[PDB]
Design a protein around this ligand. Structure first.
Ligand code: MG
Ligand code: MG
Ligand code: MG
Ligand code: MG
Ligand code: MG
Ligand code: NA
Ligand code: NA
Ligand code: NA
Lengths: 131, 49, 99, 192, 143, 178, 221
RNA sequence: AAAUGGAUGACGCUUAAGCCCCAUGUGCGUGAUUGCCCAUUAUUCCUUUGGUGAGGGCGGCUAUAUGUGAGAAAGUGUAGCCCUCCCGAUGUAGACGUGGCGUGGGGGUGAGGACGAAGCCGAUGGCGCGAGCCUCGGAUGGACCCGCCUCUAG
RNA sequence: UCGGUGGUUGUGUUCUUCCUCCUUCCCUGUCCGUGCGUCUCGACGCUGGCGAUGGAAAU
């Protein structure tokens, strides 16, 4: 299956918005927190400080949620879930759940190859061989 | 833009042709020579009157 | 006075000293030559094996003159030239040629 | 319209020559139309000047409009002198602004002029059906000056391409604001 | 008027004409001089072949943006150059079919140069090499 | 071409009306950079002399006057400038120039350097081309005599902008750098 | 400088003998101090190697009394709590030029420190610089295009003496020795200079008749 | 005329790099009307987000198997039903909105697990403006746990 | 533009503009034509370098 590849995919920003001064304290997480301080230099938008997220960074609605391969990810848990992705072959790729065991993964991978449904965490060799 | 100007003003081709004729070498030489004569004759005659 | 902007570079060429002379070089190709520390891939790596070396080049183009003394403005394709090139040699080629 | 412009210029030249040949002077008609441009920002404007600029539709820097020069309007221009620069337009300045920066106000929307049909649709009058009609109704005054100019969005122009002398201080002092007579055409040629 | 679809259509500078001497600015033959022979049927590259005896540049293709067309020209009415066609370059030691084409065209080019009144000076001119010395300005020249 | 302050002649009058039909027509000679400044000076003079304001008057002419030729002449300019702590100061000065506009432009620059007076504090009363034998300044009368000669010394000779070297060889024009 | 055994051994294997980088030698006689320093500092930042000689002949506008007083005011400044940390007051003319150039560079970045490393600033013309090549001058700071004739000026060497410099006699003794040796050598080889001049002449009438005409057209013969 | 050594910002500058004025590309008493540098400003192009928003399509008959192809919902709000166009976007105290994110438990519905659940580790990458979600590896662990709609709170 | 042709504006005690109506030369560029079987998204020419299943190239 070959997806509809976008001509160009543009990300406005690649770096993540990290918390202020999270590198100086081991207990502080790097997830973003909005600073609320009267004298805060990040809040007041000084020139050499970190940036805060806002609506201008939003991704182009045309290429949003599209992975570099050109597919969209849909979680898959069993063989029956593979039949929802059969018709929309070129738009969606299945993602096998983390907790699905190795015994059940054999049936899913075997069935997906027959149906020509792309999986992102299958076996690489089976994807390489063409029929 | 040439086709936008013509679309807004259908008379532009005739307006540009008049400017091209004014730019012509022979016609502008006669026009300048004739203008000098006309001004000279009127000035001389008005002073005499 | 507020700081630098690294997406454009300023290049001073020998024997120009004039804006009218700098206008002759608009559109010309420019390269910066340096060396790395091992042999990486290059153009004609397989057709001309003698070319393989530590030498590397970063290309760019001349956009417009700068000031009145013959300085030009240069954009280096997509990226920017490294700051270790400040004060070093830049090659200004004669192509593409309008003459 | 082209014939009318050429006839008017020839008549004015003949009268001026007739006066000069006989040792007298010919007085010209007072100007009827002006072009007003805002040359200052939106910070620290007193309430009276702020209200006048809103009534002139000049809410942004380098916005330009056409006005009629009657006594009620001239008294408004004098009150906001240090905020505007204005003068008397020429035929080429009017043509350039309409053909290059002209946007109509249709249904509350700012629509760029691309053909005569939308001009005829916006102005239901039969005297305004083409771009030359808009130019004439502004340059030579005309009974529909208010209808034509209010149906146009205020013109948005770029800064002067060669710079300006001094945004403070009057033009007579060597600055920029105030009345410039016909010298406003050189100022606008670098902005349009 | 010439249609863009027609083969005779071409958009090249008026300086680059058949018979014009040119200075090669890039490639293995940089700095040498050659004679422009013709242009390829479409809006393609020019075909330059300086006399192999003089400059040692064989028949090949070149983009007009990588030469400088000088003001000195040699008449090419006697020469034909009708055997130069795009497929001879499309084929991609020297084949002897290429050798005979190169030799035959060279003799006609040499004879045409000799027919020019300043033939001896031109032959020496085509032997010369262009270079940028320390302290010269190519933008002030006239070519 | 070089001088600023062109020569303008402004003609104007008060607008016709009842209680004063057929008003007097006045003439004014002014030296200004452009005709907008010329008309501003005309109405300032009219306001302070004839009690006529620009709102109730009109301008009939703003012509530019023409000078004679390109010879060397003597010009007498009587000028007045205002300053605080001194009031109005009136003086007469002599200059060498080619045209009246050039002489007056020289006078304006001269008053700036020697008395620190700006353009709008200066009023020009008149300018006249006087002959020799009646100029009273020696800095002007020293150029009158025939067979006048002098050499050029302490010259600073700068090259044309295209040559303009930076480092040059000590005993040659070799232009090592630039 | 001072090649160790690692350097000499590598040159021996490779076959290299000598190398000389591209260097400009500037004769600083009769040059305005401030104008020459500003021109040289910009050229250093542009990637140039510069050696300046005769630093004792630099000139300063004003009288010697005025300039001597200016230096004595600079000498008065020192860190009161520990003068060995305070500003250092160099006294030789060549050290004064380097300090002046240093104040026209960004001296607290690696870029400026590298630029200052490319200037040498000798006094007089030392023996290792005499035979390198022709010297150059800066016409924008030559003091006969800069100063009015009637204005008094200071010579840097005279001012550097009387405030602490104690090598004026050594420099003038070596300079006089250099002039005699250079003058004697230049008078020699006058025969070969004349012989070459007499060779370019009479080369004409031996060349072909067409090349002489081309030389005449371009004003070379 | 004052109390640490020291400030036109420093160096320095005197045919100024000082004071008062005048000009400008290629060619300054023969090209009349832009010498050049720097913004979160102006014009213009692309993308996002919100509207006192403005228009348009939505009754699926043109023809077509595999070894030119996919969608189309009468709609506040989502991975927005789709396509054009116009106008705004910073903000302390404060107000309001969000088919906005996350945690323990109840009612429903659908799955996962000894071929390895929860927990823990990471130069594991991908997605989202973000709160976060998901895959990967463990030379970790050894028995439980989650997606979606709703209800509830120590 | 030229030569004539009668109405017009304005000085001065006739001439000065502008018109309409012919006569000479001189310049430039005229007319016609192509809606879709409801809507949307998708389709990236020529020349060379690199890539032939590898501890490979490219992003
Ligand atoms: Mg991201
Ligand atoms: Mg605060
Ligand atoms: Mg300014
Ligand atoms: Mg907000
Ligand atoms: Mg609980
Ligand atoms: Na941390
Ligand atoms: Na103010
Ligand atoms: Na300062």
């Amino acid at each position: 299956v070959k997806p509809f590849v976008p001509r160009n995919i543009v990300k406005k920003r690649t770096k993540k918005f990290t918390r202020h001064r999270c590198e100086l304290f081991p207990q502080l997480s790097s997830s973003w927190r909005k600073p609320r301080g009267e004298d805060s230099p990040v809040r007041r938008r000084y020139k050499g400080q970190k940036a805060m997220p806002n609506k201008g960074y939003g991704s182009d609605r045309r290429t949003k949620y599209i992975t570099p391969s050109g597919f969209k990810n849909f979680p898959v848990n069993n063989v029956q879930d593979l039949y929802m992705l059969l018709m929309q072959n070129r738009k969606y790729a299945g993602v096998i759940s983390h907790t699905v065991g190795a015994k059940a993964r054999k049936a899913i991978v075997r069935k997906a190859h027959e149906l020509d449904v792309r999986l992102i965490n299958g076996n690489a060799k089976l994807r390489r061989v063409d029929v | 833009n040439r086709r936008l100007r013509l679309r807004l003003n259908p008379f532009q081709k005739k307006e540009k042709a008049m400017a091209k004729g004014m730019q012509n070498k022979k016609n502008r030489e006669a026009r300048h020579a004739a203008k000098v004569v006309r001004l000279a004759k009127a000035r001389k005659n008005v002073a005499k009157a | 006075l507020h700081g630098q902007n690294k997406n454009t570079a300023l290049v001073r060429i020998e024997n120009v000293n004039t804006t009218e002379d700098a206008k002759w070089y608009v559109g010309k190709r420019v390269c910066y030559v340096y060396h790395g520390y091992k042999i990486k891939r290059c153009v004609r790596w397989s057709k001309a094996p003698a070319r393989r070396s530590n030498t590397r080049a970063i290309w760019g183009r001349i956009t417009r003159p700068h000031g009145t003394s013959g300085t030009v403005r240069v954009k280096f394709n997509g990226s920017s030239v490294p700051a270790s090139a400040i004060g070093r040699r830049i090659r200004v080629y004669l192509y593409p040629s309008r003459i | 319209y082209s014939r009318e412009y050429r006839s008017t210029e020839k008549k004015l030249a003949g009268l001026r020559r007739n006066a000069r040949q006989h040792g007298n002077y010919y007085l010209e008609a007072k100007p009827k139309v002006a072009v007003v441009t805002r040359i200052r920002g939106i910070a620290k404007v007193p309430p009276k000047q702020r209200k006048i600029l809103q009534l002139l539709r000049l809410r942004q820097i380098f916005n330009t409009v056409f006005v009629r020069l009657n006594k009620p309007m001239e008294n408004m221009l004098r009150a906001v002198e240090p905020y505007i620069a204005y003068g008397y337009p020429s035929l080429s300045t009017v043509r350039a602004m309409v053909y290059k920066r002209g946007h109509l106000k249709i249904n509350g929307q700012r629509v760029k002029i691309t053909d005569n049909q939308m001009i005829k649709d916006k102005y239901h009058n039969d005297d305004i059906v083409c771009a030359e009609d808009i130019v004439n109704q502004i340059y030579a005054c005309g009974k529909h000056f208010r209808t034509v100019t209010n149906g146009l969005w205020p013109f948005k122009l770029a800064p002067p391409a060669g710079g300006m002398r001094q945004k403070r201080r009057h033009f007579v002092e060597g600055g920029d604001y105030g009345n410039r007579d016909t010298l406003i055409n050189r100022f606008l040629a670098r902005m349009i | 008027k010439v249609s863009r679809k027609s083969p005779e259509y071409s958009t090249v500078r008026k300086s680059c004409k058949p018979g014009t001497i040119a200075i090669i600015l890039a490639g293995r033959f940089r700095g040498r001089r050659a004679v422009i022979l013709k242009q390829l049927p479409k809006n393609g590259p020019l075909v330059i072949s300086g006399p192999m005896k003089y400059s040692g540049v064989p028949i090949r293709r070149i983009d007009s943006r990588y030469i400088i067309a000088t003001s000195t020209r040699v008449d090419l009415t006697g020469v034909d150059t009708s055997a130069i066609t795009p497929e001879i370059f499309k084929r991609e030691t020297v084949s002897d079919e290429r050798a005979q084409l190169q030799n035959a065209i060279d003799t006609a080019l040499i004879q045409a140069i000799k027919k020019d009144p300043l033939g001896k000076e031109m032959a020496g001119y085509l032997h010369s090499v262009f270079t940028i010395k320390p302290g010269d300005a190519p933008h002030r020249l006239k070519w | 071409v070089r001088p600023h302050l062109r020569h303008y002649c402004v003609v104007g009058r008060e607008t016709p009306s009842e209680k004063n039909p057929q008003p007097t027509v006045y003439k004014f000679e002014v030296f200004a950079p452009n005709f907008v400044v010329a008309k501003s000076r005309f109405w300032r003079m009219m306001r302070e002399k004839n009690k006529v304001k620009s709102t109730h008057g009109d301008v009939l002419s703003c012509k530019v006057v023409k000078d004679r030729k390109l010879a060397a002449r003597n010009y007498s300019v009587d000028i007045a400038y205002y300053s605080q702590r001194c009031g109005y100061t009136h003086m007469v000065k002599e200059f060498r120039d080619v045209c009246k506009a050039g002489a007056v432009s020289q006078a304006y620059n001269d008053l700036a350097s020697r008395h620190r007076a700006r353009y709008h504090n200066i009023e020009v009363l008149g300018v006249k081309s006087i002959p020799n034998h009646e100029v009273r300044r020696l800095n002007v009368a020293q150029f009158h005599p025939h067979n006048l000669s002098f050499p050029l010394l302490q010259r600073r000779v700068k090259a044309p902008r295209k040559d303009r070297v930076i480092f040059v060889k000590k005993n040659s024009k070799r232009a090592v750098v630039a | 400088v001072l090649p160790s055994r690692r350097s000499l051994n590598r040159s021996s294997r490779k076959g290299f003998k000598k190398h000389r980088p591209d260097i400009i030698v500037i004769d600083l006689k009769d040059h305005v101090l401030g104008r020459a320093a500003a021109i040289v500092a910009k050229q250093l930042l542009l990637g140039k190697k510069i050696t300046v000689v005769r630093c004792e002949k630099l000139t300063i506008a004003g009288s010697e009394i005025r300039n001597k007083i200016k230096y004595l005011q600079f000498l008065r400044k020192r860190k009161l709590s520990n003068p060995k940390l305070g500003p250092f007051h160099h006294r030789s003319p060549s050290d004064v030029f380097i300090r002046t150039v240093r104040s026209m560079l960004p001296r607290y970045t690696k870029r400026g420190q590298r630029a200052l490393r490319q200037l040498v600033a000798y006094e007089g013309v030392p023996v290792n610089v005499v035979r390198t090549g022709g010297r150059v001058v800066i016409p924008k700071a030559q003091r006969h295009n800069c100063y009015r004739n009637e204005r008094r000026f200071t010579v840097l060497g005279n001012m550097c003496k009387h405030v602490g410099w104690k090598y004026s006699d050594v420099v003038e003794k070596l300079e006089a020795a250099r002039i005699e040796k250079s003058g004697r050598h230049h008078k020699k080889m006058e025969k070969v200079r004349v012989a070459w001049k007499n060779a370019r002449k009479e080369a004409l009438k031996k060349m072909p008749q067409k090349n002489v005409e081309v030389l005449k057209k371009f004003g070379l013969a």
